[PDB]
Amino acid sequence: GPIRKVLLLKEDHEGLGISITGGKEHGVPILISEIHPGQPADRCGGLHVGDAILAVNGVNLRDTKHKEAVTILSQQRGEIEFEVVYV
């Protein structure tokens, strides 16, 4: 599908509210495999299961390994911009 930019608002006491799979070491993108009900990703409205996360706050994730992506994603705070695509 089209590449989308999506805004997420997170409070400091919460996580993003997603599960991710994949990573470069597996030859597949960082993919959203779960959107947890009521948590920030669900609330933002624009992120969905099956979306590939291409970037977050301008950081490219298309070539990141799984645990690299976890570190980068978990570091983001507040108003967080995602670049995503549903294939």
Binding site: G15, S19, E34, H66, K67
Partner: peptide
């Protein structure tokens, strides 16, 4: 085969 992380 593929890892999953909750974040």
């Amino acid at each position: 085969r593929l890892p999953t992380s909750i974040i």
